[PDB]
């Protein structure tokens, strides 16, 4: 059958639970689409963005060559002066807010406000809401989403494949003046938006800040000018998502699963699998998790201290989180103190499992128990034990044998 008839397999990870995650498939041959820019993708998928998230008609929407949803309704490209408040100055929100003058006041008044509705003018526009039972899936080797990214919100049955998203650029990022010591900017669009969503399966996708590397967006007010958030995040009781064979690359923030640590609406959900997946240079999130027991397994993890993007940490353990990780493969390019490879958020002694992890530094290549190694540099301890046991996949591959598989098969362009 064609790629847009493909599901997910019995087991394969958290989104297999129950019926498991067939997206389109079943779609009716007047339901599938080839679209070729943000007018035909919002038409394929409704006809009016904000209305398609009721959209369950399954339906399979294969995208041909590169799609630019910062565009106006002609498709032609638009850029900040498109989205820009009457009352709006970049200069004047500079002048105003700066720390050194602002200080770390709530930020508030006419300029804040005329920036919240900028935001929300290039919000309502690039940020795609995808139906129930969509199968989205790239055409060939060079399926493109950049500007924009799918929001998947209160839906189910969703399967997004072989595409290669360029992160969205925030052209109105908000300036937190209390994120931190020294403050943060921050920003709103993902590629990929998991909100209160259940069995989605994100497959071979290739997610990378491409042209628009954080390196290049400048500095403002002493801090990097982060116009980008989340590669593919998960939150507001999400479940049953698998995460396999995409490539996450050249960006800072990667995949949040539970978005606070005071949503208790999250315990009991947030479950996901990711696996073979290649994180090469990016910086944390690999993935940060809250409330979900969310197996890791087989993914390689590849950092070089010459990428514009440094390295902070890979693995976030975060309030109430089952982490479960088996066999996944870390390589740096320095002599790296691998305690510095997980992180925790919690005031409690949480609980995650690990084994065959392997680290290949400069100064060696070994299985190593990063637990361990987390629990001997620092305060709060991690509990290594086996509080569940994962069931949903098929197949685990002996640790050295990742590098070479996720290298040659994960990311767009690498199916068939
Ligand atoms: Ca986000």
Known sequence: ????????????????????????????????????????????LGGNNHTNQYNSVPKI?????????????????????????????????????????????????????????????????????????????????????????????????????????EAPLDYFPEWDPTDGTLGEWNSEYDSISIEGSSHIWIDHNTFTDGDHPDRSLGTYFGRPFQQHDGALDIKNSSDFITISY????????????????????????????????????????????????????????????????????????????????????????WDIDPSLIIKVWSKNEESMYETGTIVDLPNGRRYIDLVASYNESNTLQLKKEVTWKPMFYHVIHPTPSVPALVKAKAGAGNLH
């Not at 005071?262 to 009991?268: H, L, N, T, V, Y």
């Open 61 to 165: 929407i294969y995208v041909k060559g590169t799609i630019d949803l910062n565009v106006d309704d002609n498709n032609q490209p638009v850029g900040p002066d498109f989205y820009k408040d009457p009352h709006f100055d970049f200069e004047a929100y500079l002048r105003e807010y700066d720390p050194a003058t602002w200080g770390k006041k709530e930020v508030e008044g006419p300029l804040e406000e005329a920036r919240v509705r900028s935001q929300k003018k290039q919000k309502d526009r690039i940020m795609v809401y995808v139906g129930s039972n969509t199968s989205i899936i790239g055409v060939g080797k060079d399926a493109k989403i950049k500007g924009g990214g799918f929001l998947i919100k209160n839906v189910d049955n969703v399967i997004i494949r072989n595409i290669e998203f």
């Open 246 to 333: 995409n490539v996450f690359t050249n960006h800072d923030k990667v995949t949040l699963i539970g978005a606070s640590d005071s949503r208790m609406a999250d315990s009991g959900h947030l479950r996901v699998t990711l696996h073979h997946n290649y994180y090469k240079n990016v910086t944390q999130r690999l993935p940060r998790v809250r409330f979900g027991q969310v197996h890791i397994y087989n993914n390689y993890y590849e950092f070089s201290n010459l990428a514009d993007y440094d390295f902070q940490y890979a693995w976030g353990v975060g309030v109430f989180s089952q982490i479960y990780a088996q066999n996944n493969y870390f390589s740096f390019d």
């Open 1 to 44: 059958k064609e790629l847009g008839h493909e599901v997910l397999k019995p087991y394969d990870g958290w989104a297999a639970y129950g019926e498991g995650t067939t997206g389109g498939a079943m779609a009716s041959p007047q339901n599938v689409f080839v679209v070729t820019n943000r007018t035909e993708l919002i038409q394929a």
